[PDB]
Amino acid sequence: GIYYTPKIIVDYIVKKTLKNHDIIKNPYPRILDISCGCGNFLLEVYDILYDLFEENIYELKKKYDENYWTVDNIHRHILNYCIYGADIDEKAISILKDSLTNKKESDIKINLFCCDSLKKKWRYKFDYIVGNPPYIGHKKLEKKYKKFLLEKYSEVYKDKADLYFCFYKKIIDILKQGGIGSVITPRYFLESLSGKDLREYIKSNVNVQEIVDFLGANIFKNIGVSSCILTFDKKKTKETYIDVFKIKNEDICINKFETLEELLKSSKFEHFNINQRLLSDEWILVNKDDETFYNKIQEKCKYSLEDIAISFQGIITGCDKAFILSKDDVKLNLVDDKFLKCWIKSKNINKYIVDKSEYRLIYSNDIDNENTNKRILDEIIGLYKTKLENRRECKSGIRKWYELQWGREKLFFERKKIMYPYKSNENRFAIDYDNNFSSADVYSFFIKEEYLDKFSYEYLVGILNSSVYDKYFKITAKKMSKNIYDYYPNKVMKIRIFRDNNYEEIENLSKQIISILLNKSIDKGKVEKLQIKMDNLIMDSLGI
DNA sequence: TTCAAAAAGTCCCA
DNA sequence: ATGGGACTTTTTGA
Numbered sequence A: 001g002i003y004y005t006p007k008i009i010v011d012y013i014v015k016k017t018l019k020n021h022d023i024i025k026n027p028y029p030r031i032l033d034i035s036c037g038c039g040n041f042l043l044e045v046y047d048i049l050y051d052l053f054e055e056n057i058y059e060l061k062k063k064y065d066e067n068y069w070t071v072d073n074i075h076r077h078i079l080n081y082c083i084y085g086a087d088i089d090e091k092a093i094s095i096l097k098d099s100l101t102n103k104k105e106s107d108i109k110i111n112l113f114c115c116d117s118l119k120k121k122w123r124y125k126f127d128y129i130v131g132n133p134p135y136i137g138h139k140k141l142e143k144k145y146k147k148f149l150l151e152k153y154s155e156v157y158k159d160k161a162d163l164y165f166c167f168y169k170k171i172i173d174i175l176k177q178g179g180i181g182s183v184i185t186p187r188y189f190l191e192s193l194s195g196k197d198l199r200e201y202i203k204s205n206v207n208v209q210e211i212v213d214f215l216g217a218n219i220f221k222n223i224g225v226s227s228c229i230l231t232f233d234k235k236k237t238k239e240t241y242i243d244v245f246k247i248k249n250e251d252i253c254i255n256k257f258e259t260l261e262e263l264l265k266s267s268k269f270e271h272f273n274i275n276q277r278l279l280s281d282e283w284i285l286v287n288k289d290d291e292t293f294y295n296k297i298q299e300k301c302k303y304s305l306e307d308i309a310i311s312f313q314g315i316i317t318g319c320d321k322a323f324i325l326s327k328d329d330v331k332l333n334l335v336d337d338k339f340l341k342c343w344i345k346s347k348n349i350n351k352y353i354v355d356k357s358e359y360r361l362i363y364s365n366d367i368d369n370e371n372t373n374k375r376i377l378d379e380i381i382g383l384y385k386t387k388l389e390n391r392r393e394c395k396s397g398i399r400k401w402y403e404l405q406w407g408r409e410k411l412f413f414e415r416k417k418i419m420y421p422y423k424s425n426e427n428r429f430a431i432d433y434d435n436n437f438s439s440a441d442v443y444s445f446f447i448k449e450e451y452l453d454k455f456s457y458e459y460l461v462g463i464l465n466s467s468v469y470d471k472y473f474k475i476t477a478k479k480m481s482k483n484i485y486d487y488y489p490n491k492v493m494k495i496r497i498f499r500d501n502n503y504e505e506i507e508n509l510s511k512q513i514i515s516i517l518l519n520k521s522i523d524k525g526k527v528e529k530l531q532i533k534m535d536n537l538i539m540d541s542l543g544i
Numbered sequence B: 001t002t003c004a005a006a007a008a009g010t011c012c013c014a
Numbered sequence C: 001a002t003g004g005g006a007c008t009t010t011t012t013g014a
């Protein structure tokens, strides 16, 4: 339930919010952590504040009450007026209170609240806010609390949104005018469709000073999440430019230097600036060379995949072990071949073509009644009946216990089409010739009838598999973990395509590559040469 | 009725 | 034991 932020990052965030504070002008700053936990951030804040007060004690004594401002009174003052924490875990709050007391008679009152930060009536705003909020996705969040969030945090929380969206909104709302906030959250809201409303909220309510994007680097040990650090303020500024620090090597160990600033200035990161006013609903955080590249491609292409194609997600059985069998399984002798479909996984998809399938799907929707094919139900599917009965559509009666949860439309699959994995390190679009079915880890599309004369499957896999389109898609794609991007229709269908004088030769090269890849003695080397030639053709076409 | 999004991923090994 | 690499289910809101 508790996650420890590495000390280097905590130090960076506290220094980011407090390094230029004018303690003489305002000796009563309110610093808040609304998910403080054991006190990772607040103890460092206490250290920084103590040094800040102690270095200016005599100036404070001369400008204000000379009896109040003594070194012996610093500790008490810090706990009374400066440090605020909130967390829902009682034990963490008790431990933090003990630590803050032990940093150094009457008892000082420590501003630590044990509550739900999203429900607390906050009585005042704050000068500085730091911390690491909790991340809960749509599956792991309780439905009652989700009803609450959808009612009260609708500006950022809808559909498949995350709890830390609400923490972002809460932080922004309780930040004093001129205040500074700095947090570490998952990076996914920067590009995801669920994060659109949250991105709009941030852009329209704060000045984003700085974004540190670690991409697929493993910041939290033994945790599968990809992180970023956001720093924003509510200052009166007429410029609103963002400093973006994007990591270049995801294999880096984070403790190579003493400070995170040394790492950011180093050759391990790239830095660039983004105009906050030029942000659309999407945040395209790239350097000027990449921006030029992306804009050239966008302007030159007249069509998008959405215009010319029909997209769809694969089968969602709701229990794969009940419906998927190895093609050499003896139990398939009980199933009529009219009920069997070819089944592939994301790993069976290469550039341009699909591996031969090793699995079969029982399309159980076509089973009329339980008495005609009783053997299939009793001996194959029924072995998981309990689990099958706990699916949502079974509990509500919309679906029989032996039916596929989301069987889609068969006719969408039993046709020539293009398939691609839902998560990959590179563009892998293939032409499926074999009426392959797949789960939701594989997405498919086919070309609309009215665009068949303008675009062929061979040409499309030719350009989509090129290095140009690999880089082009990765510009705006959703970076998930190390060497993994989401390849989902909400972005894949936005890919723009072109049609010009190089169409015929690109198509010929694609057909040659496909012909070689379907041979017995594959000579992959000539495939690589042909791909290089096609990439040259594409770069000529797009004017890069 | 029925779409598609969602990594505090998941699991294994050296 | 940890860190790194291969690979990806079904719950869920709309």
Ligand SMILES: Nc1ccc(CCNc2ncnc3c2ncn3[C@@H]2O[C@H](CO)[C@@H](O)[C@H]2O)cc1
Pocket: A001, A002, A003, A034, A035, A036, A037, A038, A086, A087, A088, A089, A092, A115, A116, A117, A118, A132, A133, A134, A135, A136, A140, A141, A142, A145
């Ligand atoms: N199902 C569900 C039901 C209710 C909630 C309440 C959300 N409200 C919260 N308010 C304040 N602190 C919170 C918190 N949730 C977690 N935290 C702390 O955050 C830190 C993580 O690093 C931990 O120290 C954790 O305790 C969440 C999920």
Ligand SMILES: [K+]
Pocket: A061, A062, A063, A064, A065, A066
């Ligand atoms: K004085």
Ligand SMILES: [K+]
Pocket: A216, A217, A218, A219, A223, A224, A225, A226, A481, A482
């Ligand atoms: K990671």
